[PDB]
Amino acid sequence: GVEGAAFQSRLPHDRMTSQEAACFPDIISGPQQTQKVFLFIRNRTLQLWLDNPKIQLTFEATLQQLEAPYNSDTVLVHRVHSYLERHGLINFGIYKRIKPLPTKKTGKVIIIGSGVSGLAAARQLQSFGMDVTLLEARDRVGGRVATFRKGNYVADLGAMVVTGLGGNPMAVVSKQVNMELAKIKQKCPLYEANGQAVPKEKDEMVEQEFNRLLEATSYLSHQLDFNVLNNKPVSLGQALEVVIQLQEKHVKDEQIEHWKKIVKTQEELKELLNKMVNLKEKIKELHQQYKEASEVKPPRDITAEFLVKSKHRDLTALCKEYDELAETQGKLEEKLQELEANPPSDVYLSSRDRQILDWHFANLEFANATPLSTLSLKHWDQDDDFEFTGSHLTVRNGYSCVPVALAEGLDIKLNTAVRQVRYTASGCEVIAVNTRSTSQTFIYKCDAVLCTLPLGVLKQQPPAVQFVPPLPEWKTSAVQRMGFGNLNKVVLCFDRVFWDPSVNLFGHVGSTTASRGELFLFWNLYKAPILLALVAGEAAGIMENISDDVIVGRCLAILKGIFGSSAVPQPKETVVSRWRADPWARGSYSYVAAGSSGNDYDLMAQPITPGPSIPGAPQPIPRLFFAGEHTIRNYPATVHGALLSGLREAGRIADQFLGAMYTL
Amino acid sequence: RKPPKGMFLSQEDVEAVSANATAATTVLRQLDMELVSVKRQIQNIKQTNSALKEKLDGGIEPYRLPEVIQKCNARWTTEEQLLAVQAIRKYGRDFQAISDVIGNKSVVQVKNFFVNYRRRFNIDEVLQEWEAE
Ligand SMILES: Cc1cc2c(cc1C)N(C(=O)CCc1ccc(-c3ccccc3)cc1)c1c([nH]c(=O)[nH]c1=O)N2C[C@H](O)[C@H](O)[C@H](O)COP(=O)(O)OP(=O)(O)OC[C@H]1O[C@@H](n2cnc3c(N)ncnc32)[C@H](O)[C@@H]1O
């Protein structure tokens, strides 16, 4: 309904957010009726934009289509629209300006990096009538949204997946830019080192154990509070080892008490036989006695008669005792045969079993772009709450078209490496060089600077960008604490598809746990015959120091093993990512390192306000702003997260320099 | 609130597997060594009881005795009075074993026999002598 719009805009349809409490403190402290009005006015405007997002949604346009009792308060509708338009909840992306854009530009902002966060902020700021220039070290826009293109071949080496349109802003962008979106069939068959598919009964076993082990950690972290150890934060990798150990321990604890039941009974029987043998010996001699008494032939005196009759009662008596004992001997004899044929589990996981487990671990090291030894046990899955609904997709025409679509109509200086950022009470100065010849030096002066420098760049020591004055201790510390990860990609261009073209992806189980991520997953995503091979976890950084030919070799081998040496030809063209080596990234995306938290992502976004130039002067305005995927606590390491951060700062910057007139 | 069914991990255990760098291997190598010790013990009682089973070959079939049907007559022949007194001295008050010895008398007649002939046979004196044993 209208309420679908609130969900698709990541907003609770039935209460006001902390954001809106700020801009509309009257309405939230006000009577619950005026609230309901507002939230409807919001949702309906969100709707109108959403239904067609290829055209600007002007305020007048909104008010026309809204009907009473709600279109009675024109100032509310005007406040609501202006709030939504500011924070890119409507009229963001690539719309068609109804009102052509006034050339009365107010303010000048310098944006570092033509990435998706940068691209999004620049369009918004320009959308708001500001002077924006984007500085750019590379000779192309997109940053980590790279897309390879040679002839008919197309394959991104950066992001390739849109994770769900359920509340994804990329949903809107896919209608503004013709993105050919294809779903990803979940089915992924695993193939072991030898080249034989894992049997279905095995596949399902290990996977289930995998999720079983992941719950295990969470229970251990939340219920047992196992989150510090030796004055160090516990990682997810440690908590997994501990859980696996404790399962291997339980296996043994079970065998121990199983055989302990068996030897209790053997001992219990062994003492039965002892009675049996002694009694049988006794019976043996008492027979002889009864027999000898029987031999004295009659006629006999009563004592000699008594002695037959009584040795007869005596021997029958012992014959019943011993009869009851082999009644009991049979009762324990089968129990021993039972328990010996009811043995519990021999192992917890076999060598071959674990190897399959590792692939699930490699797959999980790829999702977070880091070895599980570094992920925070407590916090690594905090974004896993805000997931989008729907299925993950890919971009058949290359994810490169989004940035390029955004880059339309913007001032972008490529081959321009920012090298010192200099911000003071009266304005800022950005100093860049030409990348091709580092001779040419450029000085850019501006009211504010938006920094979308990758976190790996901000991390670099010695610094590749100098901040004057230096970033304060709270912001650097955040940068140290945070995780910037690494996940590599190999793109294999062939003249003929010899894979199962109904499988989007299939995996390869590694030989050892140390190299679980070395090319452990392949993707068939494109119309052209192209396979993508992932390099995750510890394998990622190690493989950057290795010849491409070698890497494509190890690739070829693996495929040959899976499909036969004569079905896989040499690839016509090949490319391999070296993201950590790239100096304009120095990583792939951020992760929630152990000792970090989500708070750090919010630290990363707080803007910097410089000290007064003249002592005793009034508190200055903030001048340094941060966006980028590492700055958005709720949706990190994703293209949409970068985008939303860009929309966010452009909203922040603009309220700061153009003024927010929507708080009356 | 509870760990996923079929995953065991108690507060007690986790600490023991975390206390030292090699503690996890150390405990596991105990149970490993302890399991073989109990396994070797099992062989021993198997060997011991395989022996004790040879000694019981043939069971007691050759030492068994045939059963005789025996209608409980209530008359006390002078002989079977004398079997009773000897039985009393041999057993005391196992009224049942005594009944087994005579073979034609049941516990009740056996039981009150002690009273009808208590005087005439000095049963207390007989039992008194039977106590000393
Ligand atoms: C490297 C890479 C990045 C991504 C991916 C792959 C690779 C290889 N993606 C994936 O396979 C899977 C990731 C993934 C998937 C699902 C989930 C998830 C989680 C929870 C729930 C559901 C799903 C999580 C992860 C992938 C993906 N984002 C996505 O949604 N889809 C994907 O499927 N991700 C991340 C994405 O790629 C980035 O998060 C975003 O692309 C970054 O954008 P920004 O940081 O804003 O901007 P920039 O950083 O892109 O640009 C910087 C500009 O600064 C320039 N610059 C530098 N230094 C200087 C200087 N000194 N002077 C001047 N300019 C400079 C630089 O040269 C560039 O010009």
Tab-separated table of C-alpha atoms in Angstrom, chain A residues 172-310:
chain	number	residue	atom	x	y	z
A	172	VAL	CA	15.006	2.654	-7.603
A	173	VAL	CA	18.318	3.011	-9.427
A	174	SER	CA	17.623	-0.129	-11.521
A	175	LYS	CA	14.614	1.646	-12.956
A	176	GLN	CA	16.489	4.900	-13.509
A	177	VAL	CA	19.396	3.132	-15.210
A	178	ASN	CA	18.713	0.179	-17.485
A	179	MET	CA	20.429	-2.478	-15.401
A	180	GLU	CA	19.754	-5.962	-16.745
A	181	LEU	CA	19.117	-7.829	-13.488
A	182	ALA	CA	19.296	-11.623	-13.314
A	183	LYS	CA	18.502	-13.733	-10.248
A	184	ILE	CA	21.022	-16.115	-8.740
A	185	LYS	CA	19.838	-19.717	-8.495
A	186	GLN	CA	20.887	-20.824	-4.994
A	187	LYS	CA	21.822	-24.416	-5.950
A	188	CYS	CA	25.599	-24.842	-5.803
A	189	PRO	CA	27.098	-28.330	-6.074
A	190	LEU	CA	30.473	-28.870	-4.336
A	191	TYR	CA	33.308	-30.792	-6.038
A	192	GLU	CA	36.207	-32.198	-4.020
A	193	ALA	CA	39.965	-32.018	-4.746
A	194	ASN	CA	39.848	-35.229	-6.825
A	195	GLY	CA	37.046	-33.737	-8.984
A	196	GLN	CA	34.080	-35.820	-7.871
A	197	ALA	CA	30.867	-34.152	-6.706
A	198	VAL	CA	30.175	-34.385	-2.996
A	199	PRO	CA	27.364	-36.938	-2.489
A	200	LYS	CA	24.020	-35.301	-1.669
A	201	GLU	CA	23.730	-37.080	1.697
A	202	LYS	CA	27.177	-35.701	2.631
A	203	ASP	CA	26.556	-32.161	1.291
A	204	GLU	CA	23.399	-31.795	3.377
A	205	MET	CA	25.102	-33.244	6.456
A	206	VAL	CA	28.049	-30.853	6.509
A	207	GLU	CA	26.048	-27.745	5.634
A	208	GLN	CA	23.631	-28.526	8.471
A	209	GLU	CA	26.525	-29.021	10.832
A	210	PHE	CA	27.892	-25.697	9.600
A	211	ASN	CA	24.777	-23.712	10.570
A	212	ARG	CA	24.667	-25.841	13.747
A	213	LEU	CA	28.200	-24.629	14.551
A	214	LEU	CA	27.316	-21.022	13.753
A	215	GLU	CA	24.388	-21.082	16.176
A	216	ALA	CA	26.748	-22.644	18.728
A	217	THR	CA	29.005	-19.582	18.700
A	218	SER	CA	26.086	-17.172	19.079
A	219	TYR	CA	24.708	-19.115	22.049
A	220	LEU	CA	28.210	-19.262	23.487
A	221	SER	CA	28.655	-15.512	22.948
A	222	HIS	CA	25.279	-14.327	24.238
A	223	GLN	CA	24.385	-16.870	26.943
A	224	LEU	CA	27.886	-17.754	28.146
A	225	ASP	CA	29.344	-14.241	27.578
A	226	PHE	CA	32.513	-15.816	26.139
A	227	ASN	CA	33.686	-12.529	24.657
A	228	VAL	CA	37.084	-11.896	26.312
A	229	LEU	CA	39.998	-14.308	26.704
A	230	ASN	CA	43.475	-13.426	28.037
A	231	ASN	CA	42.582	-9.701	27.920
A	232	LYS	CA	41.782	-9.943	24.208
A	233	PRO	CA	38.483	-9.935	22.306
A	234	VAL	CA	37.263	-13.304	21.125
A	235	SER	CA	37.000	-13.746	17.386
A	236	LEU	CA	34.464	-15.856	15.525
A	237	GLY	CA	37.314	-18.134	14.476
A	238	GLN	CA	38.330	-18.793	18.073
A	239	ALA	CA	34.751	-19.446	19.168
A	240	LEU	CA	34.398	-21.922	16.305
A	241	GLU	CA	37.516	-23.852	17.279
A	242	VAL	CA	36.252	-23.972	20.863
A	243	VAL	CA	32.865	-25.248	19.729
A	244	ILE	CA	34.418	-27.879	17.450
A	245	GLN	CA	36.800	-28.987	20.198
A	246	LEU	CA	33.898	-29.339	22.615
A	247	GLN	CA	32.088	-31.493	20.066
A	248	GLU	CA	35.153	-33.660	19.515
A	249	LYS	CA	35.339	-33.841	23.318
A	250	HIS	CA	31.725	-34.931	23.601
A	251	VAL	CA	32.290	-37.741	21.058
A	252	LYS	CA	34.944	-39.146	23.390
A	253	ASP	CA	32.942	-38.562	26.571
A	254	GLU	CA	30.237	-40.719	24.894
A	255	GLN	CA	32.530	-43.581	23.985
A	256	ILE	CA	34.053	-43.467	27.459
A	257	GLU	CA	30.735	-43.901	29.256
A	258	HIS	CA	29.575	-46.474	26.668
A	259	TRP	CA	32.440	-48.918	27.263
A	260	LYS	CA	32.241	-48.094	31.017
A	261	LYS	CA	28.682	-49.519	30.901
A	262	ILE	CA	30.067	-52.526	28.993
A	263	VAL	CA	32.889	-53.252	31.433
A	264	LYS	CA	30.598	-52.736	34.398
A	265	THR	CA	28.488	-55.681	33.199
A	266	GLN	CA	31.474	-57.913	32.167
A	267	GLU	CA	32.797	-57.484	35.729
A	268	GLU	CA	29.237	-58.077	37.014
A	269	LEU	CA	29.058	-61.248	34.866
A	270	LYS	CA	32.631	-62.375	35.674
A	271	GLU	CA	31.525	-62.515	39.285
A	272	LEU	CA	28.493	-64.517	38.258
A	273	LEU	CA	30.645	-67.178	36.581
A	274	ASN	CA	32.804	-67.398	39.753
A	275	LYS	CA	29.674	-68.306	41.731
A	276	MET	CA	28.691	-70.678	38.917
A	277	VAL	CA	32.050	-72.471	38.855
A	278	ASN	CA	32.282	-72.788	42.651
A	279	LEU	CA	28.701	-74.004	42.938
A	280	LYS	CA	29.208	-76.492	40.076
A	281	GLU	CA	32.320	-77.819	41.866
A	282	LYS	CA	30.196	-78.136	45.039
A	283	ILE	CA	27.436	-79.919	43.129
A	284	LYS	CA	30.131	-82.141	41.625
A	285	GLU	CA	31.246	-83.552	44.974
A	286	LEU	CA	27.803	-83.641	46.509
A	287	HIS	CA	26.723	-85.992	43.729
A	288	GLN	CA	29.538	-88.402	44.605
A	289	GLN	CA	28.280	-88.268	48.196
A	290	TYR	CA	24.622	-88.942	47.338
A	291	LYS	CA	25.842	-91.672	45.050
A	292	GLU	CA	28.019	-93.337	47.724
A	293	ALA	CA	25.114	-93.162	50.202
A	294	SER	CA	22.844	-94.713	47.522
A	295	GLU	CA	25.350	-97.556	46.973
A	296	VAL	CA	24.914	-98.871	50.552
A	297	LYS	CA	22.101	-101.246	49.578
A	298	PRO	CA	19.051	-101.690	51.807
A	299	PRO	CA	17.896	-102.801	54.288
A	300	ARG	CA	19.328	-99.816	56.161
A	301	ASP	CA	18.789	-98.051	59.491
A	302	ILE	CA	17.015	-94.678	59.444
A	303	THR	CA	20.208	-92.666	59.705
A	304	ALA	CA	21.615	-94.265	56.549
A	305	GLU	CA	18.201	-93.704	54.931
A	306	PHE	CA	18.082	-90.086	56.105
A	307	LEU	CA	21.459	-89.559	54.556
A	308	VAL	CA	20.279	-90.552	51.082
A	309	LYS	CA	17.079	-88.516	51.343
A	310	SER	CA	18.916	-85.451	52.688
